[PDB]
Design a protein around this nucleic acid. Structure first.
Lengths: 338, 176, 141, 102
RNA sequence: CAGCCAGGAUGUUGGCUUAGAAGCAGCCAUCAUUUAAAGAAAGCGUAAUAGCUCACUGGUCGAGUCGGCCUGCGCGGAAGA
C-alpha cells in the first residue's frame, strides 16, 4: 500500500583494543610488576533477517554503522571488554554487493538465520603480556588490528513464489482482488498501480500460494506517466511466472500482435533470465461471448507461436479461477529444487 | 490591554452583580459565578461593561484585557450557550448517553462511563456523534478534551474520537 | 467557469482515436462514458478539420450523458503545423532557435470562433505572441 | 456423561477430516484418564488448526478445557476435556510412539 | 498593523534537448490580452487530472503601527555522590 526504497549501507568493523603500558608499584616499593594485559576484540556486525519488515527506508537516514571499539587495557592487568555485536535487521529477500568485488555473497531466503558481514578486530597485548628480563624495562605495546572494512550494497526482492507481469491495468491488480486477502486499489481508470503488493490464497494447511503483483511498463524501457523501471527488480526471482494480455481494449493497443514486443521487453533486461518458462492466462472475458471466445483464444494463442496449454479465465467476476488454483500447485510441489 | 478599552455589550434581561472582585452573570441558560484576580477594576456603566488596570501593579493592562475576554465568553453561554460536536469514527465504536452519563465502547475490555459536571449535557443525534452543550467555555472545553483523551486520534487512519473542526493528517510509516 | 465539481480538460490530439498510453481512460470516470468520445464530440469537429488538440469542459451534474460546448483550440500547436519546426527547443536559449513574422499568426489567430478577452483587435494581436517567443524565437513585429 | 462425550468428540473430529479414528477403552490400565482418542492430521498446520476447533467447541459446550500443549510445535498437540483426552498429532511421529497398546 | 467577508482569472495542461510533469529539484523568456487588483507564480502535497491556502486587490471596526542597531540589570547553558 506504500512506497518502496532501496539503498546502500556503510558498515565498519570494530578494530581490536589497544595494549596498555603501566606498572604495579602501589605504596612502598617503587619497583614492582607491570600492569596492563589484553585489550578487547572489536565488535562483529551481523546480518539479522526479519519477516516483520519489508522495506529499507531506515538505511538512508542512518547510513554509517559504527561497531563499538574494543576496550583498551587498564592497570592491575584489567583486560578490556569485547566490543558488542551490533546487528542490522534486514527484510528477508536482500542481496549483498561489495564495492570492488561486486558480486553476490549471500541470498536472503530463509528467515531467522544470521550472516556475518564484518569480521571483528583482534585485541592488543600489554606490557604484562610482554614482560621480560632482556629489556629490564618492559614498556612496549602492540596496537589492535583494524577490522574488516566492507561496504554493502543492498538489493531487495520480496518473498513470493508466483509473479505478476503484464500490460498496464490489464487485470494484474484485479487478479489480486480474488480470494486473495490483499486488495490493492483496482479500477478501470489509468494504470492505478504505484505499489508492489503480494497476497496469499488459503486452500489447505501448510500450503502456500504467495503471489506478488508489480507495476508493468509499455514499449520496453519507456515510461508513460511517471512510473520508473525500478519496479522490475522485485521480479526475476519467483519460481513460477504467469502472463496475461488484455483482450479487446476500448482504447488500448491491438491484440497479442503487439505482445511480441513484450517478449523483447523481457529480453531487454539482460538476457530474459535464461528464457524462464512462461504461462499465459487471459482476463476480461465476461464482456464478450464465451462460446465465441473459445475460437478467439485458440486462434490468438497460435498466432504468436505459443503451442502450449493456455488458460482462459475471467477473473473480473471470479469465474473459472479454480482451474488455475490447483494446476499451479502440481507445478510447485512436484518440482522441487534439484 | 487595549482589548479591555473596548467595552463588551451584554443583551437585555441579564443581570450583572458585583460584590467587589466577584461577578454574578445569572442568565437564561445557566447559573454560574466567577471571581476576578484582584488586579482589575470594573465599573457598572450603561448597557456595556468597561475594564481597567489597578495602580501599583506592574502587569496592569495585561490582566485587564483578560477580563473582557472571559466575560464576553460568559455572555453567549447565558443567552444561547456553547455547543461542541464529537464524532466517533471506526468499526465497533458505539456511543450513547444515559442520564448524565455517556457509555463508550471504544474497543476496550470494559465499557467507559464518564461523569459530566452539573451544567454540561450531551445528546446523541446518531450512534457516532456526541453533541456537547454548555454555558461555560472552560468546563465544556475540558470535558471534550477528557472525552478525547480516552481514544486520542491515531495519526495513520484517523481512527478515534475527534473534534468537528479538528482535522487529523494521515501519514505512512514503514512504507510497505 | 462557475464553481466546484472539477472542470477538467485532457487532450493530445483530436484527429486520432483517443489514445491509451498518453492519457488513457482519464477522460472521465464520475459519469462520463468512454464510448461517447465519438458520438457527440465528433459532431462538428469531424466536419471542418482534424489536426489540432482541443480542450473541453465536462459540466455534468447528475445526467448520464454530457451537456458541454466545444471552444477554441490552443494556440501552442499553431507554431508547429503552421509556423515552422515540429520538434522545438533543443537548447532553448544557447542561440536564436527559431523565427517568426509579424504577418504570421494573424489570420490563424483570428479563426477562433468565440473565446476572447476584450473586443479590441489591436489588444488581442499581441496576446497570442505571449505564448510565442518563449520557445527561443526571435520577434520581428 | 460416559458415552456422550466421545460421541460429541467423534462427530466433531470427523468434520475436519479426522482420519483413522479409533475408540479405545483404557479403563483399568491407566488411573489418570477414562479413555483416549487417537487420530492423524495431514500437516502440522492441520493439527494446529484443528486444535483450536476442539477447544472453541468445548468452550461453547460449557465444559472448560483442563490444558493444551501446542506451543511453537505442531508435531504433537493435545487438549483436555476432563475425562476424555484426544491426541491430534502427525502421522510421521505416530509410528515412533505406541498405537492401540497403551 | 493584525483580524473577518470575497476575487484569487484569460492565452494557460505555456511549449519543451521534455519517458509524464497541468505552478513545483531539469528548461526559458518572465511578457501579456478583460477588469478594483490576482503571479507561465508563494505550499500542504496525489500516479496526472488534483483537493485548498497564500502573494496582490475590494469592503468592514478604527489611530497608532511596522523591524533593525547600541547599552545596564536579568534566563537557559550550570549533573556527584
Amino acid at each position: 500500500m506504500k512506497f518502496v526504497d532501496e539503498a546502500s549501507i556503510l558498515v565498519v568493523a570494530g578494530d581490536g583494543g589497544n595494549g596498555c603500558v603501566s606498572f604495579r608499584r602501589e605504596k612502598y616499593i617503587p619497583k614492582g610488576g607491570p600492569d596492563g594485559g589484553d585489550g578487547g576484540d572489536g565488535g562483529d556486525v551481523w546480518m539479522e533477517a526479519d519477516e516483520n519488515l519489508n522495506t529499507l527506508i531506515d538505511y538512508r537516514f542512518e547510513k554509517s554503522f559504527r561497531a563499538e571499539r574494543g576496550q583498551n587495557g587498564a592497570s592491575r592487568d584489567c583486560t578490556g571488554k569485547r566490543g558488542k555485536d551490533v546487528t542490522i535487521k534486514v527484510p528477508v529477500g536482500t542481496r549483498v554487493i561489495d564495492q570492488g568485488t561486486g558480486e553476490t555473497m549471500g541470498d536472503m531466503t530463509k528467515h531467522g538465520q544470521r550472516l556475518l558481514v564484518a569480521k571483528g578486530g583482534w585485541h592488543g597485548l600489554g606490557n604484562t603480556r610482554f614482560k621480560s628480563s632482556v629489556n629490564r624495562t618492559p614498556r612496549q605495546k602492540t596496537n589492535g588490528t583494524p577490522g574488516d572494512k566492507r561496504e554493502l550494497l543492498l538489493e531487495l526482492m520480496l518473498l513470493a513464489d508466483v509473479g505478476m507481469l503484464g500490460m498496464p491495468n490489464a487485470g494484474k491488480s484485479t487478479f489480486i482482488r480474488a480470494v486473495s486477502a490483499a486488495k490493492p486499489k483496482v479500477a478501470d481508470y489509468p494504470f492505478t498501480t504505484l505499489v508492489p503488493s503480494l497476497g496469499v490464497v488459503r486452500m489447505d494447511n501448510e500450503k502456500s500460494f504467495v503471489v506478488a503483483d508489480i507495476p508493468g511498463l509499455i514499449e520496453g524501457a519507456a515510461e508513460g506517466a511517471g512510473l520508473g523501471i525500478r519496479f522490475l527488480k522485485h521480479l526475476e526471482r519467483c519460481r513460477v511466472l504467469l502472463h496475461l494480455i488484455d483482450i479487446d481494449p476500448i482504447d488500448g493497443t491491438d491484440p497479442v500482435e503487439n505482445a511480441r514486443i513484450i517478449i523483447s521487453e523481457l529480453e531487454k533486461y539482460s538476457q530474459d533470465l535464461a528464457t524462464k518458462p512462461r504461462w499465459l492466462v487471459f482476463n476480461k472475458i465476461d464482456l464478450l461471448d464465451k462460446v465465441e471466445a473459445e475460437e478467439k483464444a485458440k486462434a490468438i494463442a497460435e498466432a504468436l507461436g505459443w503451442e502450449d496449454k493456455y488458460y482462459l479465465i475471467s477473473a473480473a467476476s471470479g469465474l473459472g479461477v479454480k482451474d488455475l488454483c490447483w494446476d499451479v500447485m502440481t507445478f510447485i510441489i512436484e518440482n522441487p529444487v534439484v | 490591554s487595549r482589548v479591555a478599552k473596548a467595552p463588551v455589550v451584554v443583551p437585555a434581561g441579564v443581570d450583572v452583580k458585583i460584590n467587589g472582585q466577584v461577578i454574578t452573570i445569572k442568565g437564561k441558560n445557566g447559573e454560574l459565578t466567577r471571581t476576578l484576580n484582584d488586579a482589575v477594576e470594573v465599573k457598572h456603566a450603561d448597557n456595556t461593561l468597561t475594564f481597567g488596570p489597578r495602580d501599583g501593579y506592574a502587569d496592569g493592562w495585561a490582566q485587564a484585557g483578560t477580563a473582557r475576554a472571559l466575560l464576553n465568553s460568559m455572555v453567549i453561554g447565558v443567552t444561547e450557550g456553547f455547543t461542541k460536536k464529537l464524532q466517533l469514527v471506526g468499526v465497533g465504536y458505539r456511543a450513547a448517553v444515559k442520564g448524565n452519563v455517556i457509555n463508550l465502547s471504544l474497543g476496550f475490555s470494559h465499557p467507559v462511563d464518564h461523569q459530566l459536571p452539573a451544567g454540561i449535557t450531551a445528546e446523541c443525534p446518531t450512534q457516532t456523534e456526541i453533541v456537547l452543550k454548555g454555558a461555560d467555555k472552560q468546563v465544556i472545553g475540558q470535558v471534550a478534551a477528557d472525552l478525547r483523551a480516552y481514544r486520542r486520534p491515531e495519526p495513520y487512519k484517523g481512527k478515534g474520537v475527534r473534534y468537528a473542526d479538528e482535522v487529523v493528517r494521515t501519514k505512512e510509516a514503514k512504507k510497505k | 467557469a462557475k464553481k466546484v465539481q472539477a472542470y477538467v480538460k485532457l487532450q493530445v490530439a483530436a484527429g486520432m482515436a483517443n489514445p491509451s498510453p498518453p492519457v488513457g481512460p482519464a477522460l472521465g470516470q464520475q459519469g462520463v462514458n468512454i464510448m461517447e468520445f465519438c458520438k457527440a464530440f465528433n459532431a462538428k469537429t469531424d466536419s471542418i478539420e482534424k489536426g489540432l488538440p482541443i480542450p473541453v469542459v465536462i459540466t455534468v451534474y447528475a445526467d448520464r450523458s454530457f451537456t458541454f460546448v466545444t471552444k477554441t483550440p490552443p494556440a501552442a500547436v499553431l507554431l508547429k503545423k503552421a509556423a515552422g519546426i515540429k520538434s522545438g527547443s533543443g537548447k532553448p536559449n544557447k542561440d536564436k532557435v527559431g523565427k517568426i513574422s509579424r504577418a504570421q499568426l494573424q489570420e490563424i489567430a483570428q479563426t477562433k470562433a468565440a473565446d476572447m478577452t476584450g473586443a479590441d483587435i489591436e489588444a488581442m494581436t499581441r496576446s497570442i505572441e505571449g505564448t510565442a517567443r518563449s520557445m527561443g524565437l526571435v520577434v520581428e513585429d | 456423561q460416559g458415552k456422550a462425550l466421545q460421541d460429541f468428540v467423534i462427530d466433531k473430529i470427523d468434520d475436519l477430516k479426522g482420519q483413522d479414528i479409533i475408540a479405545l477403552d483404557v479403563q483399568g490400565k491407566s488411573s489418570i484418564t477414562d479413555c483416549m482418542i487417537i487420530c492423524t492430521g495431514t500437516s502440522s498446520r492441520h493439527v494446529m488448526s484443528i486444535a483450536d476447533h476442539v477447544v472453541q467447541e468445548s468452550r461453547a459446550a460449557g465444559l472448560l478445557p483442563l490444558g493444551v500443549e501446542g506451543e511453537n510445535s505442531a508435531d504433537w498437540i493435545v487438549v483436555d476435556l476432563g475425562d476424555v483426552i484426544v491426541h491430534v498429532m502427525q502421522e510421521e511421529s505416530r509410528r515412533l510412539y505406541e498405537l492401540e497398546k497403551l
